[PDB]
Paper text:
In coronaviruses (CoVs), nonstructural protein 16 (nsp16) and its non-catalytic stimulator nsp10 assemble on the 5′-end of nascent mRNA to perform the last step of RNA cap modification—S-adenosyl-l-methionine (SAM)-dependent methylation of the 2′-OH on the first transcribed nucleotide base (N1), usually an adenine. Here we report two structures of the nsp16/nsp10 heterodimer complex in the presence of a cognate RNA product (Cap-1) that consists of N1 and an adjoining N2 base (me7GpppAmU), and a byproduct of the methylation, S-adenosyl-l-homocysteine (SAH), resolved to 2.3 and 2.5 Å, respectively.
The K46 side chain, which is at 3.39 Å distance from the target 2′-OH in the Cap-0 structure, moves away and resides at 5.04 Å from the 2′-O-me in the product structure.
Numbering used by the authors:
A (entry chain A): 1 to 298
B (entry chain B): 18 to 132
The structure:
Amino acid sequence: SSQAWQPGVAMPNLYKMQRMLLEKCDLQNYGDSATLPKGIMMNVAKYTQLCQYLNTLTLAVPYNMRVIHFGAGSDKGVAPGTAVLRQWLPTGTLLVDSDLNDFVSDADSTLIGDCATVHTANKWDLIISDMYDPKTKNVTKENDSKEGFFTYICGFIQQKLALGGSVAIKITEHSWNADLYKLMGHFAWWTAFVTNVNASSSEAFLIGCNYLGKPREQIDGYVMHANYIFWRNTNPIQLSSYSLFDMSKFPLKLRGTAVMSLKEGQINDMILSLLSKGRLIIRENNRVVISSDVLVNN
Amino acid sequence: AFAVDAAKAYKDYLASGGQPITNCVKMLCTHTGTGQAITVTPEANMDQESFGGASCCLYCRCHIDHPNPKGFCDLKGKYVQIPTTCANDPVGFTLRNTVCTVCGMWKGYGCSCDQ
Ligand SMILES: Nc1ncnc2c1ncn2[C@@H]1O[C@H](CSCC[C@H](N)C(=O)O)[C@@H](O)[C@H]1O
Ligand SMILES: [Mg+2]
Ligand SMILES: [Zn+2]
Ligand SMILES: [Zn+2]
């Protein structure tokens, strides 16, 4: 009813509790396009609707914040998603980006190569990714779980994210992984989100909120992807541009959250309580350094 | 004693009748800002549009050296404002005009600094 005036739609709680088997996806409006304002690209409108939805959750925001972004280049040689993120965040925040082919950008610093050659010395407050492999198009057997760059991402999170931060990572019908669903059970809340401007595709973003460092609940990953395909097959959604015309309240808010250093064996029920409600960060506070590996031959 | 000169070369190409450079990056905003030339966040009024800075610089896009003692770039990492009747060639507009150093407006399209 009122759905066409929001920025998008999220997956309801009673669909998460069932036990279904996997089938093929078949959408009623599979090939349609939407009507955009006079001079605007499809990739600028998609990133604006995702930041409007994150304004309704309980994120942490300290003095001197740190952010990193994977898969950032286009087939024409520039970077439209990096320019929307710099408009949203507070003045003085530090930002770094990366990809496999060459391009030019507005960030503070940039690196070129395959994602498995990157290393850093410090820890981070928020993480974003849009990667996708072209030979996934060439379908010739049953639909099973995939590896590749998904194996690098699971290990970076367990080793370099601060207690109290957040993430968002992109998927489709044939591009997915079973150990990433199992790790959503180590945060305080989770979901999956679809934008109103690309509603005729099987794409979505997977989101985790306030990190704790051990399991709260047990989850089987093969069963939970079959529950996601059953919701999309029985509930159709209609294309819309309404929310792009009102920008009087876009920028993110300034809470001044606190930061400490602590050692295992000083974690109380008191302490865990504050992490869950969005009001404490735990890490070191020195200074930032990065690099990339090179092979020599012939 | 020899060196390349690309700034004179785009001018001669345009006068003979070639098509201008495309794919510059445009943003969404309210149109009730202050109107100055180069800023830290978008500031257009009811007679202008706003763009991302690196994609409008001739040296960044051609892959060449910046003409400076310390090769320093004035646009990368900020936002720039352009008048609506000239918005089909943003690269050429910035090469040809100059900024006033006391009020911050473009000379000829905003500076009123004489009674
Ligand atoms: N193994 C890999 N390592 C690094 N980058 C990869 C990769 N597999 C895919 N990519 C990159 O993933 C990108 C998705 S293409 C579209 C990205 C979008 N224009 C954006 O604004 O981010 C491609 O440019 C591709 O180069
Ligand atoms: Mg589409
Ligand atoms: Zn430049
Ligand atoms: Zn003046």
